[PDB]
Amino acid sequence: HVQADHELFLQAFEKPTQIYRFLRTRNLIAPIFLHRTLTYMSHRNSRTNIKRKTFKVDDMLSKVEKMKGAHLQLTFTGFFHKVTLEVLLVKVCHKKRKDVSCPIRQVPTGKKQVPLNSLAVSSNEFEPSNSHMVKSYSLLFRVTRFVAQMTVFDKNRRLQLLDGEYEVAMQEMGPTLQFTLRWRIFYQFLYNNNTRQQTEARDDLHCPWCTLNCRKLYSLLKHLKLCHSRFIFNYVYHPARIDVSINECYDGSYAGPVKRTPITHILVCRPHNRLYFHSDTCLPLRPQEMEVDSEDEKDPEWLREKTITQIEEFSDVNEGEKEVMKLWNLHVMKHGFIADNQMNHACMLFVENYGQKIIKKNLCRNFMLHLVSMHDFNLISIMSIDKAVTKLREMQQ
Amino acid sequence: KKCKYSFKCVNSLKEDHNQPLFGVQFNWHSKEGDPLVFATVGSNRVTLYECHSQGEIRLLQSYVDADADENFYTCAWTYDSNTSHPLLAVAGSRGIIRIINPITMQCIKHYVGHGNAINELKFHPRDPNLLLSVSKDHALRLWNIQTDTLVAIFGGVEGHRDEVLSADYDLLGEKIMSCGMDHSLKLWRINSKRMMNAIKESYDYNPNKTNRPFISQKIHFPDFSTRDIHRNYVDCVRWLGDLILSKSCENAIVCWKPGKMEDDIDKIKPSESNVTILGRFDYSQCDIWYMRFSMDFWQKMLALGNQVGKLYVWDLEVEDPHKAKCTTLTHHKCGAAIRQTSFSRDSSILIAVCDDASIWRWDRL
Amino acid sequence: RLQANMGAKALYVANFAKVQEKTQILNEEWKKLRVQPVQSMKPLKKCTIESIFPGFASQHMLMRSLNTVALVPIMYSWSPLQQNFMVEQCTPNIDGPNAKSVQREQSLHSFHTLFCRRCFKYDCFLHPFHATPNVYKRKVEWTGAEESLFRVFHGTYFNNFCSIARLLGTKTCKQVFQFAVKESLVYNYQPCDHPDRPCDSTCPCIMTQNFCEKFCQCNPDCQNRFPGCRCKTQCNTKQCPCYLAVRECDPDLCLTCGASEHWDCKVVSCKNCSIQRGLKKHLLLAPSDVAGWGTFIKESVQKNEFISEYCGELISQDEADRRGKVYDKYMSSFLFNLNNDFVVDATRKGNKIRFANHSVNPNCYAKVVMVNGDHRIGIFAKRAIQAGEELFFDY
Amino acid sequence: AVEERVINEEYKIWKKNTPFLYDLVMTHALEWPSLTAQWLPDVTRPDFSIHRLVLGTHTSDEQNHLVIASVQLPNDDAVSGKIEIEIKINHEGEVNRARYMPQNPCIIATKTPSSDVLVFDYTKHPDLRLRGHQKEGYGLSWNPNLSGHLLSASDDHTICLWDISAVPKEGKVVDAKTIFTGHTAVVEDVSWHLLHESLFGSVADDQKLMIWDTRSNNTSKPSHSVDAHTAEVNCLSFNPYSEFILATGSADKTVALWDLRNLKLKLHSFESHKDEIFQVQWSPHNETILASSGTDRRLNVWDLSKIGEEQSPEDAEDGPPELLFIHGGHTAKISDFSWNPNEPWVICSVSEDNIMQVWQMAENIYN
Ligand SMILES: [Zn+2]
Ligand SMILES: [Zn+2]
Ligand SMILES: [Zn+2]
Ligand SMILES: [Zn+2]
Ligand SMILES: [Zn+2]
Ligand SMILES: [Zn+2]
Ligand SMILES: [Zn+2]
């Protein structure tokens, strides 16, 4: 498994799944239709219509009528001074017309013994009465063996102090006190008829991306078939096989004041393989010969004939010179040479490829002249030329 | 000399579609004494036709393809080697070359290797199995219908640089001329060892025995080219022994040959450039493209049409081509442009087509 | 003036005689054959034939259908290619008998002027003119052939008598010694000419805004020349020196990458010299489901992987302008501008990768790459592509 | 762009899934979009029965056509059926709301974008013009008990009431028999009480549901006034079976239930619709069923009998128990919908993108 096709295995299964990863969040936060209401997936519903017989919407007000028929757990804490303790709520009222001073009333809730160096319950004991007479309300926490207030409730019936522990100072007429308030499937992937991956499902029937807990295999096959339809699902009982395959004919498209024409659609009332052609001939290519005889290699003969007729058209070149020229052209075209050092081998191939041709035409002198000519361009060493021509005249002799 | 030809219009048929015809051909391969037969073609309507002494052109067969947009161009006749049956060969604008067997009345064979329209079809005269095809795609092709495969492609980098309009073998079947819109009259050859062993290997081809493709022997190098015989388009070319006859939109036929007058045809090099204009035939009113001429089997005469209707006939047995006695033929009803004419095996019957869906006939007397 | 009318008439009657006997033997061949005549069906659409002349009745016949066939798109003629193209004293044979004497500079005139350095050929299809004449310049019986051979041999060897005695063989060391005693008396790459002067503002290399290569005959200790990389790995990343610029790898200079190894195999470390070696993917032709013909790929590829290279005729800018103006009627513009100097026109010649088409969502792409000074096209992959899939890239 | 792509992809998923949910599906597109749809009481029964529909139009640079159309419904057998347009009536400007008389089904009142609303009678073929407002609106309703009584509303702070029985046939224009004005903002719905002709209800954009008495001769004070929702109130609907109970639909993404015996307490607030609700209608063939739809592109239907019931955890993950069905077959703003008074659980629904679906839920859902 190379990384490219393995990344294509991810990428080919990513972009359909990534839209489904988006539609998963969209369908959960904004469902299209309730999954319980499907006929093929109906086990999710777990109720009947028995209660509608004895029901009455005129009597619904009677049902809610009989329905119509904060728990500040201010717990004390360890004191810090140098026993018993008590809390109290101080109510401040508004300035009335007759009375000039504010009404004052200290309501002690309850005591509790705590060490230094228990709890007290208060289940919504504001007692403001909503009569436009409770201007403010404080909560004191006294100690002994050390008293102060702390704004717990705000003006608008809001929570001022946070949860957790806390501490406070004290002032008579050092000592202090504390408190603590409390309010099996198997996804057999197959793409291009290639087993890119073979897995086994973790859970039995938990869908791979929708993640619904269906207690039946027929519901899972129909859900994957109907919903999430970028793939074509085919499954056979064989521990269960699920043959996932990308739908390469899916209708990915738009598919859905201003003028437009009317229509009437009704749905329910009562329920590689394409042919090929040759390059130069354009004849139909048989499936038997596709990989064998790969065209576009083994460069064509018209280029060779062009190299022949071009230098043959040259006026101021001799016969044997043109002969060795076409021989060198056919040699370099039959075996392309890009590197310059490989040319040192190329002459050693030339006598090993066409030496018998130059002996049969008496072209050794102009061959050595061509060797010296390429030597002028600093392509090859002179001792290599000595070796090559000695080998050539050895095989010729 | 006098005309020596008592021509008279024996029949003038008109088809019921009103579409310009593009070709007509007689069954030269038929034997002697049998009832003669020829075939015309429109855009999407090929029609075989009999002919009698009293002008009774008995309608024999008429095929039409499903796709109406196809535009047929030319037709040809051939005889089978084994079954010894007739075979019509047709083509059109769809890039298709169909072979109709008139006895069974079916499309027994069809070939497709071109990109665009077919201009003209020809068959090798000696060996009846080969089949040359000219097309607008700047290249020719050569097929073998006995083995159902392609033989060769007479085109390439050195081929015509424009639409190829026509081509023709010689009478012996050893050298082919070709012409088109590129102002070039290019020669080919089917006599070298390469084309011979290629045809021989094509005869021995069988896709069921072996599993290989066919080695198509392309030809990217014609043996002679020239761009001075004409200036306008060259619509048709034919052989006369070892002489090239050619037309053009200049309203003049030209008879010539490559090289000097003493240079032999079978020793012309690729770099040969000189030519020799042997003679010319004059006429007028041939501006419209896709015009043709024709000859008989013996090639004793020559027929030609014009874009008005007054057709022309020239002699070939007599000497002095540029001083040859011409001949005209007119009528008070041929108010259309003639595209092609044709003769039977003998020079008795002449049949011509036109652009008004008309088919005219003439006969000696 | 008119001394060929009788000769023309003689040739014409000879033509008539030979074509007459040719038609005679053809008639003798045709008479051997015996073919059956046509036979009609007894008289669905209809077809009627009237007659303008009276006396002939109207002949009707029923129509007959024909078998359909799969149509294909239009394609003009072409031919394949793998390399680019371009379209714009006698000194007898040494082995022959009529040889004559000639000096070293004059003997190798045709050889030095016709030989090409950048491809090791003679009159190739991309190097129209040689650089300069100074590029090849460097710091008993005796026939003219033997004299010229001894002259060029002593020129290259500088009087090493044992070596000429080994090479020629016939002439001995003492004879050659006595004879020598009795003989003394965004622009295209272009090699510039300034051996005496240095690479300055007047040199056209800096004007072109391109780095020089091995083929230039300037100072080897210069700075304008482009030395090869020193990367051991495949160096197909942006960290490579060659991949920074448009250039590809060098065979001789880039020794560390291993480009100078034997080219017989195909498994190599350097994944950048594919254009030089030509390790292209086996493409195939097919009818496209978008517009006309198209190309398919057989084997899978990677991102930024080498698919193939474009090929065509190199021509000037105004040449391609008039060519495209001619192609405006046909509405088939397969042109591809290469650079300011030359441009590609592949209508008449090319390869399979030309048959690709344009799309707004590409998967492949093209890149200009200066392989040894040759500005070639490289068609690389912009996405991992499967087998038998369509190929598109924005022009 | 990507949002509409996702919406139409979900529509394709719904088109794949729809042969497992509904007993009948009939999606139809009109020549122009319709902000009104209503089944008629007439019916013809020759295997498929013929039913009739009234439909509005919303045109632009083209003549409007109030459509009386027909439809072919299979009753209990059979695969055939089509939509057909019977009558088209030219209309002054666009259409916002239209209503038929329950006493005389032939009389059909329609609103205009101008002041002068009109009333047609297709048997004779404006047959009866009507005026009194100063602007357009959405409110219109015939009285079920008393013939000729007709209420209408508009955003110019007026609620007109006509009684067409008093005028002669020659009199085509009729002034308001009375004009009620107690709100302090754009009133957005009014509707008669069904089984008591002497009162009606309304909701306005003052965060106020206001109940008005007809016997009282004060056209400014309502009988009751209650703050129903936190945001603007949109529409309401009375119950056909009972008389006291009614329902409201507000722009705070809620439907709610109230009663005419104690209007202070909200009985229950349904919340699944995720945008402004524009229409709610009680079912004729069932008592404990409610419906809702708006610009959320999903028509919800609720069952009141299934309220407050315990269910499975995987069943509770989908939604609350009372929500009966979510027909998401549309692809745009659900402009209107209506029930058929003589078939079980079947409805029609018209959207703004030329979509007019007609559908009936499966029997296995409600049983
Ligand atoms: Zn070269
Ligand atoms: Zn330089
Ligand atoms: Zn330099
Ligand atoms: Zn330089
Ligand atoms: Zn390198
Ligand atoms: Zn490198
Ligand atoms: Zn490298």
Residue numbers in the entry:
A (entry chain C): 78 to 146, 155 to 167, 182 to 216, 229 to 256, 295 to 322, 352 to 361, 427 to 482, 485 to 501, ...
B (entry chain B): 76 to 440
C (entry chain A): 31 to 73, 80 to 124, 272 to 322, 432 to 477, 518 to 727
D (entry chain D): 11 to 56, 60 to 91, 111 to 157, 169 to 410
Lines from the paper:
Polycomb repressive complex 2 (PRC2) is minimally comprised of four proteins: enhancer of zeste homolog 1/2 (EZH1/2), suppressor of zeste 12 (SUZ12), embryonic ectoderm development (EED), and retinoblastoma-associated protein 46/48 (RBAP46/48). One of the key biological activities of PRC2 is to methylate histone H3 at lysine 27 (H3K27me), with H3K27me2/3 being most relevant for repression.
We also determined a structure of PRC2:EZH1 bound to a nucleosome containing the H3K27M “onco-histone”. We generated a composite model for the PRC2:EZH1–nucleosome complex by using rigid-body fitting to place individual domains from our model of the PRC2:EZH1 monomer into the map. A comparison with the PRC2:EZH1 monomer reveals that some domains in the PRC2:EZH1 dimer have undergone a large conformational rearrangement. Relative to the upper lobe of PRC2:EZH1, the lower lobe rotates ~170°, pivoting through an apparent hinge point (aa 535–561) in SUZ12. In addition, the C2 domain of SUZ12, which normally interacts with a surface of RBAP48 within a PRC2:EZH1 monomer, rotates ~115° through an additional apparent hinge point (aa 146–155) to interact with the surface of RBAP48 of the second PRC2:EZH1 complex, resulting in a domain swap (e and below). In our structure of nucleosome-bound PRC2:EZH1, we observed PRC2:EZH1 homodimer formation through interactions of the lower lobes composed of SUZ12 and the histone-binding protein RBAP48. In our model of the nucleosome-bound PRC2:EZH1 dimer, the primary contact to nucleosomal DNA occurs through the CXC motif of EZH1.
